Symmetry: C3
Subunit: 334 residues, 3 copies
């Protein structure tokens, strides 16, 4: 059917780890869903030491916002590159078919904008990222990536095909940064992106990230910014890594249903302790909380988690269940 006869809905995006409102089960027919993103190059402090990088972002955040649509909707993205930026940008959706995922059609210089439309033919969570020719990994590893979730029209289903409904949804973007280091091991500082470029490339070629972070910084998902839930709540965590393999794990919990490679036509993996999300992929895990307290959600290369930054927290409220776990004899001398 002609695309102009379809309903149009405008969505205003929210900052990760939160997700714009949507329906899990499609309450309308196929729609054109309109999104707007504004590219912002900005300085970002990424660790406790105060290390500052020139970040490249969709909509001011690392990661970019989670977009949510249904299978066989059209996504129409208006991408704006304001004159206050210095670099050329575009967008590649792994959800889309053709033209390097939209990248060949979305090249915007500072002061320009573009509008792309594509049909979301496959259900799943998918990465999107910047991909300007000749400079792809530098943009991606400077923060310029996010995800899109294309839900099946009748929502998520379990391994036997019965409905799974989430009560909350969070989006964790995991970012590998490669801050250039001198012979002594200190982090180098640069006046312009062009002066930074070759040293960025050499740092990248080490294949050894200096920082691995959730939501753009060491400790961004802790303390006052801890994710929250209650005992009994069904939580979906969408997790993306545009460049590098990760292995999420909820310390004290599990992934009850896991799409490790993120595509909903496949049955979920059950009862996972840890799952592998390949670089260039987004995955999703569903968990029902059974105990209260503090949970850590980490990349289970524990060096990556506790030294390089790939750890966040859940604060969960509710009743303690002594049947599931109890201290029989509390720590004491003998």
């Amino acid at each position: 059917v002609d695309i102009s006869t379809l309903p149009r809905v405008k969505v205003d995006l929210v900052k990760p780890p939160f997700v714009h409102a949507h329906d899990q089960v499609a309450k309308t027919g196929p729609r054109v869903v309109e999104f707007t993103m504004t590219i912002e190059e900005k300085k970002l402090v990424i660790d406790r030491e105060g290390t500052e990088i020139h970040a490249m972002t969709f909509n001011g955040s690392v990661p970019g916002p989670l977009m949510v649509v249904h299978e066989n909707d059209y996504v129409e993205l208006r991408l704006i590159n304001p004159d206050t930026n210095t670099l050329l940008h575009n967008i590649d959706f792994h959800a889309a078919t053709g033209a390097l995922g939209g990248g060949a059609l979305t090249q915007v210089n500072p002061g320009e904008e573009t509008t792309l439309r594509f049909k979301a033919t496959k259900p799943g969570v998918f990465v999107y990222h910047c991909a300007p020719e000749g400079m792809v990994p530098w943009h991606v590893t400077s923060g310029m990536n996010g995800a899109i979730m294309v839900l099946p029209r009748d929502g998520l289903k379990d391994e036997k095909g019965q409905p799974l409904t989430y009560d909350k949804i969070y989006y964790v973007g995991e970012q590998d940064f490669y801050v250039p280091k001198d012979e002594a091991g200190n982090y180098k500082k640069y006046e312009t992106p062009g002066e930074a470029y070759e040293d960025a490339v050499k740092a990248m070629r080490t294949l050894t990230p200096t920082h691995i972070v959730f939501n753009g910084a060491v400790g961004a998902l802790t303390g006052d910014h801890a994710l929250t839930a209650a005992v009994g709540e069904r939580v979906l965590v969408v997790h993306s890594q545009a460049n590098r393999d990760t292995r999420p794990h909820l310390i004290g919990g599990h992934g009850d249903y896991v799409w490790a490679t993120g595509k909903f036509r496949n049955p979920p993996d059950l009862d996972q302790e840890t799952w592998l999300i390949p670089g260039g992929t987004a995955g999703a895990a569903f968990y029902t909380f059974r105990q209260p307290g503090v949970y850590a959600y980490v990349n289970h290369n524990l060096i990556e988690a506790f030294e390089l930054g790939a750890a966040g927290h859940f604060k969960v409220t509710g009743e303690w269940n002594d049947d599931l776990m109890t201290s029989v004899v509390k720590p004491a001398s003998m």
Copy 2:
């Protein structure tokens, strides 16, 4: 039902790669299974060059012992930290639900002990490891990890749900060590763990293990300590890596049925050449031997295997089957 009315069984653990006696099919109702482990900090020689590290162990071995229970048993672990140790330790079971997998409830200083109980609600093989706050990867990468197998009450089943029964079971723990190196590349030596700590952290941040070993040392599963089987025997190999991805492969064989991420409610992957066990996971592979001779069981990053130590051997006895493989023309000049 009240936990005090359940049967109690005490299990004495054995040193890997062997596994304590158990039943595959549950011959009793749900039980409380009592285990005891004694933490031992000790010097360990880890390679042929005689490199010696201050190891941190459960029960004197790297890896710690494989514990075996059935789905919906209770595990009751008495953890003892004797006064002859120097550090604080605890335990996190990926099998357990709540309190950072038991870690928040098991913090023992030297001279203290504790008893934790938890319900084994999910069937699978799972990692356990030490996780003291602020120092997690150092303890884990010093050897302080093992695994627990929670069998389904009616044993293992194949992809179509028919019984799979193993005749032997082995447990291979793969350990990544990060021995600190100077500018020349030699391995540094330290007087106390506290003097070692920052250099341990910096070595860990390289993300490049100096040693990757099975059962605590280069060549621990070779020669007189080679795993054994006979042609026709069904062998289960449980394989864990608490920190880093591995990819097991039986040179000359296959994984007939493989739970790569280790959770038995999922159907196994069939006929695997090599399988990926994510860091922070335990997996299990079942193979029926069809040929005699020497097999190597390796991490199939072959550098990790043959230079850094992640290789062991099976010696298999029995009849050679010329139908499956034969030398038609033996190596000769022309």
Copy 3:
């Protein structure tokens, strides 16, 4: 049945990324399929900078040729090591059962040959590689690896067990090289393999490839050597990595049906954006092209792809489908 009563077919191998002619559905009974490979040690230029390595090849190419047989055929390989070579070689087939995959029976010095036969009992794509005792990773990381596809006798089937038929097949071998570097970071040069060996070992122990390439060189699958297809064509891409994990991705497309770990008794994963092929494994992905133009096929660690060489191109001809993707507003100033 006695092997001498079976039909014999001789196959002449072709250079990757092309694949010798075969039938997907087995048009004969079980056969002995005869292959010949000649080992060739040669100099190879692997990057745009002109870096030259002493390569070790099966049949003159990196990767070696894709062999294709059907489940329960016999593979009979005549392996020739001519007197003009310097090193000892053998072959291990992950497809085979026993004697280190054939490696214990195929040790050929220069001037010698051997003939091995094995039964292809398991359907799938499998790695083969050189594995001389004491020197395995050096040979494998010098190019001495390929793959074999053992098709099910009734061809490939989808997740529901209905026929999947490919119109074209390509084989991409991904090779990690570890070219030794001095303190300044330049690539060292060597007079003989024996003088190269320890420095090869030390470079390998970094676990950081200097080059990651498709079909033996940076840009080998671009330009005039781009893979091709037409809109509507069903393409199977077989992808192997003998030593190191990879994560293939078709920029602008998907893996419609993916055997990530490559074994055809398992149902395929659907609609993959990116998939993980563990080191020591071969995988296969099936895609029906829906849009024309240039596609990049990359390892989606984008540093590995665009800086270290793990990127190739598809040129696809046909009709542009505006329904699937269109530029609504082309890039312009506002």
